[PDB]
């Protein structure tokens, strides 16, 4: 997702806090003065979904347009290759290799199994490897949200 | 930098010298800037101290050629070239040769004596001493280096034994330890010494560190602590910084803090660090902020000063970072307003009262545009550290002076202003004193607001809706909860939090022209789709039956090949 | 003060408790813990903490008395109260709640308890680290 519009006053980590609950992210970048920045999802869902909920919400005061673009390989690349007007020629993303069948997409994990069909059995680990999930995931992130919503309010993280 | 770029600017200068013709006193401080703003902009190396060297020799600046390369040996302890360089600018000097030069020949055998490229130093120093009449200073010498392991240890051993002719066994059997600790050393060394020269190698890459023998020096270093550890951390720090290596710096840190060594040398090395590493790595800088917060207890007062001058430093070339204020609100509020449980309440008030005016008088002043440069926060604020500044204030008014009018008038008159109000710490202390407080309707109002007015980061408003939830649920009672539900706007605090869950703009409160139909299945292209103006697919057959039924009305048909895409990447990013 | 009694009714607290008596079985004692704490009045808070953390304190269960979080959320109990002036909090605190801790748990309980100081007591950091020495 190409987001557009940054105020310059946000950063990767503040950037990465407004878009984590929409799905979990490969990489987020803000490159230096570009007015601009990146966030990688691995899902398709979690994109579109991202897209459509956020989308005029104000980060730092002015107002944010998002669309879909590219990497930062690939955006060297194609500055490259417009520079030299050569070929523009793009590469399609990668796939997840059809079928899957213990992922279920925009899931979010943070920290036995029967492997039933109700739970959710495999999961990304957050940045990267891959976790089978379990059942105290839940207590975790309820932990994690006490304790980032008790040191955020003293200002240890603006996220 | 760059060394063709380098060469090429020397290259540049070198022309232009040669097209001058004449003394050209414009043109050397051209070059005199060109070599600062090299030495500023690179690692100050060898070869660019020596270009400086040489240029100040062929300007006939003795002088100025030994200040660029006493710097870069006193900034760099591997600086062969640099300290060749002031040997011979030292050989020829004035009276006081005998104190400036033995000084320098001393730091240099305590630096990188041990190192296998130390040959040259060492014959400058059996040369001063050979030329100089101080016996005891040249035996001095020789014993230092004597017992310092060398690739030409055996030679070196064997140079000292033969030119004590006045102390050739004057300690027999310390003479004989240093020579066969020396040989053991040597031979121990050898081939970590043959693998690094094979090996170790400034390019700046991984052939670069030369990872194997970096490895081995480590381990060499770290197992076999032959008690020669004092020197032999500088000899491996010499190649470790020939290589800059975040990793290494945080080795070598914390094998000193396993050495529990003086304070002023590992703030030295944390300075040196802090200088010599370019920006954007924040870790080693805020290791040494941590190592200046848990050892200040034991001076007191210079550790004050060395943390107000980093904080300010960090805080320019990092002007959105937001830790270094509340570091540097805990260590002024610990320093300069020191409290203590023994002395008396009424003295113990005045402090945070002074706290409380100072903090208001900076903030007032800095919104007002007013900025005082006796006071160190207020030139050290930032436009991004504002609000956590103005929520200290409110916290310390609110817990200690217990001041709930005056907590309530600052919530007040701090919120409207767009400078805090889209702020995280600010709204999560608010939520915390209307917490602590019971009251439910500015909750509400709070949770109301949280999507409308209020923009906050969807973590931290997740969060908000999940705890403001919670404590709902387990303090408030059915009667409550029934009389703050209102249907026109379909508010319930049970439901809405969950409905609100993840959608930022979740509003409670002609499906053609909209940009959600327009792009429904696809998200980014936006194309109008044509339909039927009067679509019966609703209507049942039974009542269809009633009537003939009308001829369909169209919408949209011209527009079924034609799509548009708002190629925002393209248009702001690409084409800037 | 209509301080609706929460957890603090006897049909509840005593699933609450007896849910933190497993003590290493279960998974939500912290939760548990720092959800009861928030009850900021006189004796809301006077019973809180004479039911649940002076009845910890005096059993001894190792695993709450070392775990930092425990003794985070009992400092956080006693100085958010609106009841004890600021001297009085204050007081009670450096003087009754930190002598409590034995010191073999320093390695472990000083992560949280630093925080906390660091947050609220800026001055009496300097106490916190020459006594937990």
Same mark, same amino acid.
């Given at each position: 997702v190409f987001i557009g519009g940054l105020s310059s006053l946000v950063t990767e980590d503040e950037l990465r806090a407004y878009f984590q609950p929409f799905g979990t992210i490969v990489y987020v970048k803000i490159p230096v003065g570009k007015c601009c920045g990146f966030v990688q999802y691995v899902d398709r869902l979690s994109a579109e979904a991202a897209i459509a909920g956020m989308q005029g919400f104000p980060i730092a005061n002015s107002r944010v347009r998002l669309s879909w673009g590219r990497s930062a390989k690939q955006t060297a690349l194609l500055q490259q290759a417009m520079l030299s007007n050569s070929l523009q020629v793009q590469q399609q993303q990668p796939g997840l290799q059809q079928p899957n069948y213990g992922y279920i997409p925009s899931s979010t994990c943070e920290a036995s199994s029967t492997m039933l069909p109700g739970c959710q059995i495999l999961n990304y680990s957050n940045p990267q490897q891959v976790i089978m999930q379990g059942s105290e995931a839940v207590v975790n992130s309820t932990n994690a949200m006490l304790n980032r919503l008790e040191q955020g309010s003293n200002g240890f993280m603006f996220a | 930098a760059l060394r063709g770029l380098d060469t090429q600017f020397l290259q540049d200068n070198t022309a232009l010298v040669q097209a001058?013709?004449? $003394?050209?006193?414009?043109?050397?401080?051209? #070059? @005199?800037?060109?070599?600062?703003?090299?030495?500023q902009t690179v690692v100050k190396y060898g070869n660019p101290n020596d270009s400086i060297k040489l240029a100040l020799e062929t300007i006939l600046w003795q002088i100025l050629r030994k200040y660029p390369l006493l710097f870069g040996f006193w900034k760099r302890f591997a600086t062969i070239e640099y300290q060749l360089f002031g040997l011979k600018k030292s050989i020829a000097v004035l009276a006081t040769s005998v104190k400036w030069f033995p000084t320098s020949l001393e730091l240099w055998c305590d630096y990188l004596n041990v190192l296998c490229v130390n040959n040259p130093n060492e014959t400058d120093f059996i040369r001063n001493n050979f030329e100089i009449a101080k016996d005891l200073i040249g035996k001095q010498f020789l014993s230092h280096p004597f017992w310092d392991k060398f690739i030409e240890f055996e030679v070196g051993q064997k140079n000292w034994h033969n030119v004590q002719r006045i102390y050739e066994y004057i300690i027999e059997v310390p003479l004989h330890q240093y020579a066969r600790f020396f040989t053991s050393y040597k031979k121990f060394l050898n081939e970590k010494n043959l693998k690094t020269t094979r090996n170790i190698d400034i390019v700046l890459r991984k052939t670069q560190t030369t990872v194997n023998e970096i490895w081995q020096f480590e381990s060499k270093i770290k197992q076999p602590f032959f008690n020669l550890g004092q020197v032999l951390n500088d000899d491996l720090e010499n190649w470790s910084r020939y290589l800059y290596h975040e990793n290494t710096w945080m080795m070598y840190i914390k094998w000193l803090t396993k050495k529990n060594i003086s304070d002023e040398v590992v703030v030295d090395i944390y300075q040196k660090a802090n200088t010599f590493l370019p920006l954007d790595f924040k870790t080693l800088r805020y290791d040494f902020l941590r190592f200046l917060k848990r050892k200040y207890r034991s001076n007191n007062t210079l550790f004050n000063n060395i943390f107000n001058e980093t904080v300010s430093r960090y805080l320019k070339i990092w002007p959105n970072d937001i830790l270094l204020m509340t570091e540097y609100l805990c260590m002024l509020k610990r320093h300069s307003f020191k409290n203590s449980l023994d002395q008396s309440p009424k003295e113990i008030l005045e402090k945070q009262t002074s706290? @409380?005016? +100072?903090?208001?008088?900076?903030? @007032?002043?800095?919104? *007002? =545009?007013?900025?005082?440069?006796?006071?160190? #926060?207020? @030139? $050290?604020?930032?436009?991004?550290?504002?609000?956590?500044?103005?929520?200290?204030?409110?916290?310390?008014?609110?817990?200690?002076?217990? *001041?709930?009018?005056?907590?309530?008038?600052?919530?007040?008159?701090?919120?409207? =202003? +767009? $400078?805090?109000?889209?702020?995280?710490?600010?709204?999560?202390?608010?939520?915390?004193?209307?917490?602590?407080?019971?009251?439910?309707?500015? $909750?509400?109002?709070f949770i109301r607001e949280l999507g409308v007015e209020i923009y906050l980061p969807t973590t931290v408003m997740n969060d908000i809706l999940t705890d403001y939830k919670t404590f709902y649920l387990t303090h408030s009672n059915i009667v409550t909860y029934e009389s703050s539900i209102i249907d026109s706007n379909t508010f319930d605090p049970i439901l809405y939090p969950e409905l609100k869950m993840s959608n930022p703009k979740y509003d409670p409160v002609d499906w053609h022209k909209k940009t959600e139909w327009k792009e429904a299945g696809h998200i980014g292209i936006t194309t109008e789709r044509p339909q039927i103006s009067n679509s019966i697919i609703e209507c049942n057959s039974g009542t269809l039956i009633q009537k003939p039924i009308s001829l369909p009305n169209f919408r949209n048909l011209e527009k079924i090949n034609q799509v548009k895409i708002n190629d925002l990447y393209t248009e702001e990013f690409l084409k800037e | 003060?209509? %301080?609706?009694?929460?957890?603090?009714?006897?049909?509840?607290?005593?699933? !609450?408790?007896?849910?933190?008596?497993?003590?290493?079985?279960?998974?939500?004692?912290?939760?548990?813990?720092?959800?009861? !704490?928030?009850?900021?009045?006189?004796?809301? !808070?006077?019973? !809180?903490?004479?039911?649940?953390? %002076?009845?910890?304190?005096?059993?001894?269960?190792?695993?709450?008395? %070392?775990?930092?979080?425990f003794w985070n959320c009992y400092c956080r109990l006693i100085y958010f109260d609106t009841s004890r002036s600021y001297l009085d909090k204050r007081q009670y605190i450096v003087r009754k709640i930190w002598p409590q801790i034995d010191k073999k748990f320093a390695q472990s309980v000083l992560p949280s308890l630093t925080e906390f100081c660091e947050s609220y007591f800026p001055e009496e950091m300097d106490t916190l680290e020459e006594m937990f020495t």
């Open positions: - | 001058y013709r004449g $003394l050209d006193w414009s043109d050397i401080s051209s #070059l @005199t800037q060109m070599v600062d703003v090299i030495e706290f @409380t005016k +100072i903090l208001e008088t900076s903030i @007032t002043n800095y919104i *007002n =545009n007013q900025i005082d440069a006796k006071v160190h #926060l207020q @030139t $050290l604020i930032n436009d991004k550290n504002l609000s956590i500044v103005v929520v200290e204030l409110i916290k310390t008014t609110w817990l200690v002076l217990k *001041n709930n009018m005056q907590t309530r008038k600052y919530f007040n008159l701090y919120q409207k =202003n +767009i $400078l805090i109000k889209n702020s995280v710490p600010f709204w999560l202390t608010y939520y915390k004193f209307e917490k602590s407080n019971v009251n439910f309707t500015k $909750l509400n109002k | 003060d209509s %301080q609706s009694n929460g957890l603090l009714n006897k049909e509840l607290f005593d699933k !609450v408790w007896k849910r933190l008596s497993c003590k290493e079985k279960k998974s939500g004692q912290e939760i548990l813990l720092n959800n009861l !704490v928030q009850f900021y009045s006189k004796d809301t !808070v006077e019973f !809180v903490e004479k039911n649940i953390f %002076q009845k910890i304190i005096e059993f001894g269960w190792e695993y709450y008395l %070392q775990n930092g979080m």
